[PDB]
Design a protein around this nucleic acid. Structure first.
Lengths: 932, 407, 408
RNA sequence: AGACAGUCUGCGGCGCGCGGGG
DNA sequence: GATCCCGCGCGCCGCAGACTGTCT
């Protein structure tokens, strides 16, 4: 009870609130907001949790992480201090796996019977995606794998059962195995047993993940480091005056990492690039050289790992971090045959849309050529500045007759005509002037039509796009005024001829936009401004409407069809599928069941946030984009389903609880956690659209304001946002805080400097960022060692204060993963496989154990939040938090159980259920299989 | 007016439609028009060929079938609308002594060719080894009853003829809806092809009075939206109706189970499609261009190129075009046998004439063609003339048509 | 005869039940439609006729003729295949009777409603006026059309009142307007061309023959029969009808239906050429058959050219190659039977016999050796010779074979 | 007369803005 | 926010490499 807090199953009353703390908290709440705001008490549920080891909720997680990560730590230690023999003289040219014994002796082996390995794979990018060769090193010997495709014959593109085999048969000690590698996810993607639906007792370590964990750098840091490494060396540009981090930071590439962590000679880089831009034939010719290069890369990675492991353990002392990284290194995504179909449709539709965009434009070109005949370029106000190609290549039988005989005509005319054509006019026979009269009124219309030496000049102008600067003035007044003038003297449309939007009568030359300091670009306006903005016109047909809309429809798929439609997808055979998938409803269909490994870096950026360009991105199935239906078509096979959820406002809650803990021991101390907990749109004081109406444009259009402010956005950003809102003047906008910074630091020192005060407690984040000691935030993981102010002092504050919250979120994710693994291990919940997108988490689980796993993610969330609040806080927690709002069960993956799409236009037909989120209906059971 | 008025002009004049002083949109839509001109016949033939290539070619398990225009008289329940008349006028019953007054037990002209496909289903089931998923396609003429619903001078119902292309697809019941969506997607994709304004072709969903779903395709003529093609999920009702004896004969193998197939009927009216494409090909806000031209797609334009001989050394030396004509005739390039008008006509009227017939290119052979052979090649899309090559004309035209076929 | 109608009933050349089609009723149109193979063979024959007669002639244009006559002012004397021609309820010949006021000349059912066409000549005669403007008053020119016609059958034992069963015949018609002068020359020219065209695809052209005949109204005529095994059955007719048929229509006015020839106005003389495409198909099917049972249809007339199949090897990794080859062949315009997706391997000998009965030029077999070195087994229908060919050369070889067969 | 200006073509770098996601 | 990307066309150059007249 109390302030809507849950029942304290674990813990005692050793902690006391503090009367002075209570008085200060209620005084602050009265000062900012209302002290008395009763809220409906939520229902209280009690369930028998599993027995928690240790005490104080920290020993429990420590023991779980240690138990999970002991075998892999043992394997890493085995690889840490194990010397290796020299590389063999000559690599063996044979199919399969070969082990190199002493003095280079090579012996054929089924698979490496080793606990630990440093592994690297090469793939012939020119043809297919099957692996070509691989080199690995164990503590005692070298191993080399040569693919079956060294022989000459045709091979399928299915890519199943082809890649390397690395997991021994389970049915002779320490079954756990660890594989180390730089970008090891790429190498894991090329292992046979990693595509099974059932889990396996093998884990992968990424040296790049550790490098980002220790001695990592941010994106701006990456740019500065690259510039400094270059021979030579934006907007505000306040300088740095602190470049010590250059000597400790590096780029994620293997060469730079080896140089930073090892002082040996630089690794030689092969300039041939036979794997990237070479056929399989040169690979056969250059077998020894390529094997040597791969072995060099493996050796460098091993040296890097040796130098990194103790440093990483020192800077991430908590075993939970390692356990969570190991768990997050194994992701799974069943696809089934529909994925292929999707790759067709999203492609075909895209092409179709492009055609609809292209053809209309072609017509607009063709009808313009007729302007040449009349010699009336002055008549057209759009094409009179155009080239107009003034130049040219300059290169009665009154008889019945009838009734012919059976004789045949001599013909023989075509041969003579061809002879006269080819032999004479020697000049033209070489380099023919294809343009002749074609160029016409459009500016060098010949250019739009392919050169055709390789193309053959496809009908009409096929090199015509929407952003050539020729498309304006071809659709009348589409862009700004009559002249576009992408070069200097541009259209003064801004973002009657000067400053006034839209060029007319050619009043003044050169740049005269003087609205946003630039007016050169055209269109590129999210708000169409073609209904009331005016300055948009055309002759009719694919003009105005049906013009920008296709562009926005295919924009996403345009620069996505390369990353997508090329993911390494492996289709398992019938014998490989488990018992559950077979002898089940659905199934059959002569369909292909397969999987895609996301190839995710466990820690790809500052913090340890995972990075994946195709899978770990916030994108929903918007009903306007062709490829929007990504993250779907990941339906589980028959007998399996995806169970999981998102953790609500993770970042806001983390910041709120940190501020509350810093201010006092309660959860509503600073009038910000109270607003996050006891704030509702209908009644409570919600952070968004309430308590901020006095600032900005009413309640709406205030989410981004506060989001940026708690993410580090400064006052000038808010001033810029307000200036374009309601066209308020700069004087009208408050240069100082005034209405702004009411939540954040308004009084600065405020007498009595450092200190935030006001509604939001930035003191904790600032103190952590500027600590100068290894940060070790909640759950204790140090900073990347390159953004520190100790011995560096780079004043990159925007980066570290955000790093605090983001690394806290990653710690939350690690805790969730370890708790889920422990729950699945203790109780026989099949389907340990997991997927994660920042806060969002999903698990592939059997239908039989679907509800047991649905019950899970609730004890996990409760324990994770109770462990978060335990650090620098008391055990009691708000009832509203510590439990998920809903748990999705749908077979596919989507933002919400209820769905929608664009390309299919009827996706429910293709065997799509609903998703039945549970909410509170799942809290009527124990987590024992015995129980119901 | 120019809105559906000038389109009818330069249509009978250039022999795309039969000339009978009709100029009636309702007659054309219903099917009471006298017929189509040779250009119209060629355009319809090209459209039918494209439909055949897209539907039954490049599509295994789809086979041709022929349905008779008539069916046997016996066992013909129902009657014609005007055959059922028993109100009055029984004055003369003087006739002394099949025949009768109720349907006469006689044959009928088919209104749709789905019945023939359903009949041939059992026979055609053997060539697929009873693989339930398979189709039967056919293009043929169907007869329908149409009347002006005004006055009695028309008397008996008029009979209209429409060239319809129909595909009957037998699919397992479980996959019926998805297969129907696929077909609806492929038909909408095909009709938007060859179209200068694909937006004018639209689709909608409809429900049968028994609850069976289906789709309708429409083209937006200037007066309004007119139906062109219809997709219906027959739901194995008529198939069971015609075969009441036993269900074993109707069992086809889907996956590894024997099931009764579900019938999907996709029937489009080719004449209306031809009219829609003709309307689409034809085109006032600061235009000042005029230049009437039928910008039909190259794949289905009735005539590809036009030959002519102008100001040569003599009319006897025209034979250079002869043979070249034949050279174009090889590999199936349709060419207008020009170079025989022998009338002194201004080249602008001549070019406008060929533009109105929708000919992609105009080839003119001059006196300078016997030596360093170059032929003036004018393009329909843009009024610019090229010299190009006599030897490469065949290859250039083949390439143009092939590229038009694929984007 | 026996052993031929059974083979055609099987393999889906002639659609129908056993003894339904029979040897009789195939010459007449009162039989069930053709099978898919028969339909494809008919389409090939029609395409070849169109190529030889219409598009290469440079003066023959297509014409659109409706299946039914309008009905008003219908003359009371005619064949009257279907006196109704209305939607449903064809009253057939309706000879005699109709003596009462009901179903009299007043309104429909008395040579008043309309009739189904029995020949394509009338449509061409109707369109002649506009087709003159099409060719710009150039007198010598033709109009061609392939279409279905309906005829009445009789005899067939005693049925009491005759059933006048409707027989559908797919006929190709050419109406050639030529100056009345040198009309016999054009008659002989067309007769020779048609006889050559019919003999072109025949294995034994001696069976195809021509005979001459005289008419009281028409000047002269010719007939082609092909000499079926039981006897000679008329398959094509050529008639020099004369101008009186054309003069009968447009009875009023003069100097409107005449055309210019040698700069001299003259009323044209019409030649009617009418060939039975269905009977031609049946004749060609009989010609091809002949000690294995094989239908040696001409390469330009065979419905299916090549057949794909899989022999041994993995079930997968060959279906993909077969699909690729299938797609390439269709992209190149070659019809192929997708036998690769067949599930019972059955027998090689039985498979070859089945494809021989279907008149497939070549049999293509893809095995694991194809994956090894890209070699496929190729069997020729004509000479039953088996060879090995690279998979990348099959398309070119087939196109070359078809082109060589097309030429003399 | 033979040798050298152009035009074109290939191909390389760097500015300019614009759009998905961090 | 955060500064930062990749897939376009413009452009604006550059330098080789080829072909065509062009100059002495």
């Amino acid at each position: 009870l109390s302030r809507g807090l849950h029942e304290q199953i674990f813990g005692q009353g050793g902690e006391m609130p503090g009367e002075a703390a209570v008085r200060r908290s209620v005084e602050h709440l009265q000062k900012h907001g209302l002290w008395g705001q009763p809220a409906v008490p939520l229902p209280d549920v009690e369930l028998r949790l599993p027995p928690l080891y240790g005490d104080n909720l920290d020993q429990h997680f420590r023991l779980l992480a240690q138990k999970q990560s002991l075998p892999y730590l043992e394997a890493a230690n085995l690889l840490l201090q194990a010397q290796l023999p020299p590389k063999p003289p000559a690599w063996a040219w044979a199919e399969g796996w070969t082990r190199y014994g002493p003095e280079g002796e090579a012996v054929p082996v089924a698979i490496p019977e080793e606990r630990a390995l440093v592994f690297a794979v090469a793939v012939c990018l020119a043809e297919g995606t099957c692996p070509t060769l691989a080199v690995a090193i164990s503590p005692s010997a070298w191993y080399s794998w040569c693919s079956q495709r060294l022989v000459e014959e045709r091979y399928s593109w299915t890519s199943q059962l082809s890649p390397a085999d690395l997991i021994p048969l389970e049915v002779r000690d320490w079954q756990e195995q660890l594989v180390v590698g730089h970008n090891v996810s790429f190498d894991r993607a090329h292992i046979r047993e990693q595509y099974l639906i059932q889990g396996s007792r093998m884990r992968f370590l990424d040296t790049m993940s550790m490098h980002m964990a220790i001695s990592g750098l941010s994106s701006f840091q990456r740019s500065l480091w690259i510039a400094a490494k270059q021979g030579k060396h934006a907007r505000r540009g306040p300088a740095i005056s602190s470049w010590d981090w250059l000597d400790i930071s590096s780029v994620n590439s293997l060469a730079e990492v080896h140089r930073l962590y090892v002082g040996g000679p630089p690794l030689e880089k092969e300039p041939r690039e036979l794997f990237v831009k070479g056929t399989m034939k040169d690979i056969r010719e250059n077998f020894q050289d390529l094997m040597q290069y791969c072995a060099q890369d493996v050796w460098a990675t091993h040296e890097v790992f040796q130098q990194q492991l103790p440093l990483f353990l020192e800077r991430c002392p908590h075993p939970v971090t390692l356990a969570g990284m190991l768990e997050m290194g194994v992701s799974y995504l069943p696809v089934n045959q529909n994925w292929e179909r999707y790759l067709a449709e999203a492609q075909g539709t895209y092409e179709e849309l492009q055609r609809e965009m292209k053809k209309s434009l072609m017509d607009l070109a063709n009808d313009a050529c007729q302007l040449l005949s009349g010699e009336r370029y002055k008549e057209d106000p759009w094409l009179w500045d155009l080239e107009w190609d003034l130049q040219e290549f300059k290169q009665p039988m009154d008889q019945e007759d009838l009734g012919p005989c059976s004789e045949e005509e001599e013909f023989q005319q075509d041969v003579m005509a061809r002879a006269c054509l080819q032999k004479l006019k020697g000049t033209t026979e070489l380099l023919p002037k294809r343009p002749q009269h074609l160029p016409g009124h459009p500016g060098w219309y010949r250019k739009l039509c392919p050169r055709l030496d390789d193309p053959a000049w496809t009908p009409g102008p096929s090199l015509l796009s929407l952003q050539m600067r020729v498309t304006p003035k071809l659709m009348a007044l589409t862009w700004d005024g009559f002249p576009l003038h992408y070069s200097e003297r541009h259209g003064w449309g801004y973002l009657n001829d000067v400053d006034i939007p839209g060029c007319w009568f050619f009043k003044l030359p050169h740049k005269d936009g003087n609205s946003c300091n630039v007016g050169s670009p055209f269109a590129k306006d999210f708000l169409p401004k073609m209904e009331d903005g005016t300055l948009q016109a055309g002759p009719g047909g694919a003009s105005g409407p049906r013009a920008l809309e296709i562009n926005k429809m295919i924009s996403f798929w345009r620069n996505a069809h390369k990353r997508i439609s090329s993911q390494m997808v492996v289709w398992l055979p019938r014998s490989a599928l488990p018992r559950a998938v077979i002898r089940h409803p659905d199934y059959d269909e002569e369909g292909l069941y397969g999987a895609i490994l996301p190839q995710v870096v466990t820690a790809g950026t500052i913090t340890r946030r995972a990075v994946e360009p195709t899978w770990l991105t916030a994108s929903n199935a918007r009903p306007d984009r062709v490829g929007s239906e990504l993250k779907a078509m990941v339906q589980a096979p028959p007998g399996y389903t995806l169970v999981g959820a998102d953790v609500d406002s993770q970042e806001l809650w983390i910041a709120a609880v940190l501020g509350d803990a810093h201010f006092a021991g309660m959860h509503g101390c600073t009038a910000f956690g109270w607003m996050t907990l006891q704030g509702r749109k209908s009644r409570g004081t919600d952070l968004h659209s309430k308590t901020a109406t006095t600032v900005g444009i009413s309640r709406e259009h205030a989410k981004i304001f506060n989001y940026g402010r708690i993410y580090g956005a400064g006052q000038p950003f808010a001033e810029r946002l307000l200036m374009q809102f309601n066209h308020r003047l700069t004087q009208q906008e408050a240069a100082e805080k005034a209405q702004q910074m009411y939540a954040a630091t308004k009084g600065l020192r405020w007498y009595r400097w450092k200190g935030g005060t006001e509604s939001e407690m930035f003191n904790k984040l600032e103190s952590i960022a500027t600590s100068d000691i290894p940060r070790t935030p909640v759950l204790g993981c140090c900073i990347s060692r390159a953004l520190e102010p100790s011995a560096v002092q780079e004043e990159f504050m925007t980066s570290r204060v955000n790093w605090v919250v983001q690394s806290s979120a990653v710690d939350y994710l690690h805790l969730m993963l370890v708790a889920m693994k422990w729950l699945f291990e203790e109780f026989a919940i099949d389907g340990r496989f997991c997927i994660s997108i920042h806060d969002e988490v999903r698990y592939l689980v059997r239908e039989e154990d679907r509800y047991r796993a649905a019950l899970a993610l609730q004890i996990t969330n409760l324990l994770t939040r109770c462990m978060f609040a335990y650090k620098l806080g008391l055990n009691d927690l708000p009832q509203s938090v510590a439990f998920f709002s809903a748990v999705d069960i749908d077979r596919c993956l989507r933002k919400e159980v209820t769905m929608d799409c664009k390309t299919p236009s009827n996706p429910t037909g293709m065997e799509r259920r609903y998703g039945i989120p549970q909410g509170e209906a799942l809290d009527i059971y124990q987590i024992i299989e015995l129980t119901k | 007016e120019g809105s559906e008025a000038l389109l009818e002009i330069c249509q009978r004049r250039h022999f795309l439609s039969g000339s009978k002083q009709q100029l009636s949109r309702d007659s054309l839509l219903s099917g009471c028009h006298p017929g189509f001109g040779p250009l119209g016949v060629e355009l319809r033939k090209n459209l039918a060929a494209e439909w055949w290539t897209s539907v039954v070619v490049f599509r295994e398990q789809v086979f041709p079938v022929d349905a008779l225009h008539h069916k046997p008289g016996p066992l013909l329940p129902g009657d014609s609308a005007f055959r059922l008349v028993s109100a009055e006028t029984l004055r003369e019953i003087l006739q002394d002594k099949f025949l009768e007054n109720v349907l006469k037990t006689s044959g009928k002209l088919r209104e749709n060719l789905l019945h023939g496909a359903l009949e041939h289903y059992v026979n055609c089931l053997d060539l697929v080894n009873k693989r339930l998923p398979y189709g039967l396609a056919q293009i043929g003429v169907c007869f329908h009853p149409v009347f002006d619903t005004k006055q009695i001078r028309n008397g008996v119902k008029s009979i209209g003829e429409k060239t319809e292309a129909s595909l009957v697809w037998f699919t397992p019941p479980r996959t019926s809806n998805q297969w129907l969506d696929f077909w609806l997607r492929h038909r909408l994709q095909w009709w938007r092809k060859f179209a200068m304004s694909p937006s004018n072709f639209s689709s909608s969903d409809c429900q049968d009075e028994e609850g069976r779903k289906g789709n309708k395709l429409y083209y937006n003529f200037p007066w309004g939206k007119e139906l062109i093609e219809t997709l219906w999920n027959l739901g194995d009702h008529e198939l069971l109706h015609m075969y009441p004896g036993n269900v074993s004969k109707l069992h086809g193998r889907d996956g590894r189970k024997n099931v009764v197939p579900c019938v999907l009927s996709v029937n489009g009216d080719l004449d209306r499609g031809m009219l829609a494409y003709l309307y689409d090909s034809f085109q006032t806000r600061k235009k000042n261009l005029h230049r009437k031209v039928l910008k039909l797609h190259p794949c289905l334009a009735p005539i590809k190129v036009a030959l002519d001989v102008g100001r040569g050394p003599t009319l006897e030396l025209r034979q250079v075009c002869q043979g070249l004509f034949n050279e174009l005739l090889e590999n199936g390039i349709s060419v207008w046998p020009g170079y025989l008008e022998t009338m002194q006509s201004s080249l602008e009227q001549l070019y406008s004439k060929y533009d109105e017939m929708s000919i992609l290119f105009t080839v003119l052979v001059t006196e300078t063609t016997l030596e360093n052979g170059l032929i003036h090649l004018r393009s329909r899309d843009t009024t610019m003339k090229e010299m190009m090559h006599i030897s490469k004309l065949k290859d250039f035209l083949i390439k143009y048509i092939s590229s038009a076929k694929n984007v």
